[PDB]
Amino acid sequence: ASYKVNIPAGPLWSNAEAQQVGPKIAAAHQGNFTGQWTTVVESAMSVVEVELQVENTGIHEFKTDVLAGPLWSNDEAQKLGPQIAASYGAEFTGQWRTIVEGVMSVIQIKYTF
Amino acid sequence: ASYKVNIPAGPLWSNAEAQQVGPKIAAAHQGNFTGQWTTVVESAMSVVEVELQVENTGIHEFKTDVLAGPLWSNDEAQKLGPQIAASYGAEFTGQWRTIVEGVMSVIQIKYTF
């Protein structure tokens, strides 16, 4: 199954640029650009409508760390990791670390494509 | 300046769960959960509305690689990199590399917080 969300694209100056760039942003998020887009902050930010899969499948994988917000402990990270990872369209591997005490932590996620 | 987008959260089974999870996903994406949410695929996927800032500033940073879709040349990476980075709420450092020939590349982004 799939669904749609708007994803930031930075400023998009024309429909011509949007139709060229939208598919690139979508591909980076394992989705497909629908053709619809909106400037949300004049000369500063636009978003593109991207169709995403509830579950990404494929035979390749890539692992990396992304922001997780500040996490209190490993036990909380194990509890919240899966959902935070799902917000990136990926899975949580269980690995994580705080990078700035009281401010920010990161989790390792796994992309399948 | 700010703007709002819906971010995947996986299935959310009650408003209570959404209010507990929404802030965590928002914090992982450097935004503020608005309290609003929607299920987009019954029993499989819900999204939480998050207010993002056009520009994320701060004295701390974290660099990492993220999916960039397939990139065919340094020229395309230079052109698309900042835009793809913006789609992650971050900045493009200029570094990138293909991870699966003809299928996928990644770019290095810098989160500032």
Residues B72 and B38 in one domain: no
Annotated binding site of B for a carbohydrate: 11-15, 19, 35-43, 70-74, 78, 94-102
Show binding-site residues of B: 11-15, 19, 35-43, 70-74, 78, 94-102
Pair B7, B23 in one domain: yes
Burial of B54 (0-12, 13-18, 19+ CB in 10 A): middle
> Does residue B55 contact residue B2 with C-beta atoms inside 8 Å?
no
For residues A48 and A61, state if they share a domain: no
Interface of B with A in 73-102 (CB under 8 A): 80, 82-84, 86-87, 89, 99-100
Both A68 and A91 in a single domain? Answer: yes
Residues B89 and B37 in one domain: no
| Residues A48 and A9 reside in one and the same domain | yes
Distances (CA, A) of B2 to A42, A80, B25, B108: 11, 26, 17, 24
> Minimal CA–CA distance to A111: which of A78, A75, A66?
A66
Chosen domain end from A55, A72, A98: A55
Domain that holds residue A75: 56-113
User: Contact, A83 vs B24, CB < 8 A?
Assistant: yes
What lies within 8 Å, CB to CB, of B94 at 6+ separation is B78, B81, B108
- The sign one gets for the Cα dihedral A51, A60, A25, B86 is positive
The residue among B45, B9, B43, B44 whose CA lies nearest residue B26 is B9
A93 and A105 in one domain? Answer: yes
CA distance A105 to A65: 10
User: Do A44 and B54 count as a contact with CB atoms less than 8 A apart?
Assistant: yes
Do B62 and B48 share a structural domain? no
The DSSP code sequence of B30-95 is: TSEEEEEEEEEETTTEEEEEEEEESS---S-EEEEEEEEE---SHHHHHHHHHHHHHTTTSEEEEE
For testing contact with chain A, the best of B17, B20, B24 (most A CBs within 10 A): B24
For B100, the enclosing helix (H) or strand (E) is: strand B91-100
Same domain, A61 and A101: yes
CA distances from B44 to A105, B50, B55 (A): 27, 20, 32
Split into its structural domains, chain A has a count of 2
In whole angstroms, give the CA distance from residue B111 to residue A31: 22
Method by which the coordinates were obtained: X-ray
**Residue A46 annotated as binding site:** no
Residues A51 and A1 in one domain: yes
Q: Which residues of A52-91 are buried (b: 16+ CB within 10 A; e: fewer)?
A: bebeeeeeeebebbbbbbbbeeeeebeebbebbbbbbbbb
Find tokens 């965590």 and name the residue.
B24
Residue B109's domain is classified under what CATH number?
3.30.1490.230
> Which of A55, A77, A94 is a domain's end point?
A55
Same domain, A22 and A49: yes
Domain final residue pick, A14, A38, A55: A55
